[PDB]
Amino acid sequence: DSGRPIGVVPFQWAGPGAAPEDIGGIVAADLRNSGKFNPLDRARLPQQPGSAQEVQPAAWSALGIDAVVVGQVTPNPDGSYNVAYQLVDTGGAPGTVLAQNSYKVNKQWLRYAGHTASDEVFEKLTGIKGAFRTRIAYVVQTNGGQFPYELRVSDYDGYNQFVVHRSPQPLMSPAWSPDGSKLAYVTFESGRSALVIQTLANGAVRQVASFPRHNGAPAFSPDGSKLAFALSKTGSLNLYVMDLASGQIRQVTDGRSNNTEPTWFPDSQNLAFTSDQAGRPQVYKVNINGGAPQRITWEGSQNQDADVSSDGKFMVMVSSNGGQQHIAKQDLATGGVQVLSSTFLDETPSLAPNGTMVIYSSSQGMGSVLNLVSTDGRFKARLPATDGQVKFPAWSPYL
Amino acid sequence: KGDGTGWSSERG
Ligand SMILES: [Ca+2]
Ligand code: NA
């Protein structure tokens, strides 16, 4: 129902006025974001302990809380900062340190230091790899006239955004390479649609495909050797795969129907995609070495835009169920579907590399904004807003 | 500017 109760104490700050960042706020919000933890409200804390020994287990047990996060933040002549946390047991081992660490970071990595604490605590208590130091990429339509579309990247939680690319035409569907160093996207900069790959550090741009008609929807294979995308030069959209070492392209689908929005399975062999071949969009699957695709979505009237988990256990998608469209999960072994979001005009979902969260676009006014839903359905939140309309969120791999 | 499906993430 609500996530496992946990106490996050405001981190101890030694110095000038107020701390430069609320490290324990970051740690609380992250843990809340995963759906897994219900951090006790800061106002409701029984004690603001500043280290592992200043923690009173009784106080915490009494509230159903078996772990407390405390930390410290100190400054360094060098303009840098020391950030430390201790995860203390208040359950079976009252007063025991379960995890702890120490960083030296510049002010600009304070959020990062909070996210490292989050990741470490998260993983110790759940045994699941933390995803709080991973980013998202998306397209923003701004109010600027000349370059209204802006391929951007930020931290999964909205902070620290930067611009990768500005365009006078539209940009669509960004995709991360599995090492997180490149993004693939559709650009219309030419007058026509084209698929490029951009190195983030560099800005270097590799041209991938520009055939007649349509070129879109990229997905990098998990092993890093391929790029799947859709092309409609035959007459309808069909799936193609490119060998990145050679530049060589295969046709994966043939079909008078439209086949688009490829997504990989963990084996870099199979893809799930969307096809209208059955009328209203449905999710299908196919091997890149051929064979016929198989439908895999029988729940609801329409299912499109899939994202398969990194372990291949499930998939998220845009689904029309009970007469409307939301983000929903399909257990790939059992077959069950769960509706996750409850906002309006839910599009483009993307999974976090540990499968605990989904980022998606939703409709608000004449504009788009970004939403985050835990994969268990418990936690829903809108991200900080920005200066224009936001579409096409892509969650990065671990970084 | 789109893929000309009317259904996809990439229509317009
Ligand atoms: Ca997609
Ligand atoms: Na952040």
Residue numbers in the entry:
A (entry chain A): 32 to 430
B (entry chain B): 9 to 20
Copy out sentences from the published article reporting this entry, exactly as the authors wrote them.
Colicins are plasmid-encoded, protein antibiotics that consist of three domains; an N-terminal translocation (T) domain, a central receptor-binding (R) domain and a C-terminal cytotoxic domain. ColA interacts with TolB through a TolB box (DGTGW), that has been localized to residues 11–15 in the T domain of ColA and shares high sequence homology with part of the TolB box of other group A colicins such as ColE9 (DGSGW).
The structure was refined to 2.6 Å resolution; and the model has excellent geometry with no Ramachandran outliers. Our final colicin model fitted the density very well, with clean difference maps. TolB, as previously described, is composed of an α/β domain at the N terminus and a six-bladed β-propeller domain at the C terminus with a tunnel through the centre of the β-propeller. Our structure of the complex of TolB and TA1–107 has revealed that the TolB box in ColA is a 12-residue peptide with the sequence of 9-KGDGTGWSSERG-20. The first set of interactions are predominantly hydrophobic in nature, with only one hydrogen bond between W15 of ColA and D307 of TolB.
